[PDB]
C-alpha cells in the first residue's frame, strides 16, 4: 500500500478552485488514462460539486468521464466524486483524498494520493494525515507533480 503526498508550491485560485482542487483534476485525468478507476474523496458536498464541474474543463481538450457518487452508470463512473455523507461505488483502484483528516476507508486502497497545501495554516492537518497513513501501514512518499 502506497500513499503519495503532492507538495503544492502555490495557493493560486482559478475559477473558484483551490490550487489543490486544480491539481486533483490533473491527477484524476492522468490516473483514469492509465486505466484506473478513481475515487475522489471530498471534505464536503460543495467541494464535490465544484470538482464535478471542473473535471469537464480541466485538463482542457479532454473527455474525462465522471460523476458524483450515486450518479452515472451502474457501478459508478470511471472517476467518482464522493463526500463524507455519501456512500461510494466499489471496485476502485486509486483514492485521491481531499479529506482534512485521515479517513478510515483509505485502507481499502492500495494507492492513495494526498496533499500538502501551500498555506501555513493547513500544514498541521497535513502532518497529522501523514502520521496516520504511516500507522495504517502505508509506504509513504512526497512528490511534485509535473
Amino acid at each position: 500500500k502506497n500513499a503519495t503526498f503532492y507538495l503544492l508550491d502555490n495557493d493560486t485560485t482559478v475559477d473558484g478552485l483551490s490550487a489543490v482542487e486544480q491539481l486533483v483534476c490533473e491527477i484524476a485525468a492522468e490516473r483514469w488514462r492509465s486505466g484506473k478507476r478513481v475515487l475522489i474523496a471530498c471534505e464536503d458536498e460543495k467541494q464535490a460539486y465544484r470538482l464535478d464541474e471542473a473535471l469537464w474543463a480541466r485538463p482542457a481538450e479532454s473527455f474525462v468521464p465522471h460523476n458524483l457518487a450515486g450518479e452515472g452508470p451502474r457501478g459508478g463512473a470511471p472517476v467518482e466524486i464522493a463526500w463524507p455523507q455519501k456512500r461510494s461505488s466499489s471496485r476502485r483502484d486509486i483514492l485521491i483524498s481531499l479529506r482534512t483528516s485521515f479517513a478510515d476507508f483509505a485502507t481499502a486502497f492500495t494507492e492513495v494520493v494526498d496533499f500538502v497545501p501551500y498555506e501555513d495554516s493547513l500544514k498541521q492537518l497535513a502532518r497529522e494525515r501523514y502520521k496516520a497513513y504511516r500507522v495504517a501501514g502505508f509506504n509513504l512518499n512526497t512528490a511534485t507533480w509535473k
Partner: peptide, 4 residues
C-alpha cells in the same frame, strides 16, 4: 519523520 515528516519531510514537510
Amino acid at each position: 519523520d515528516i519531510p514537510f
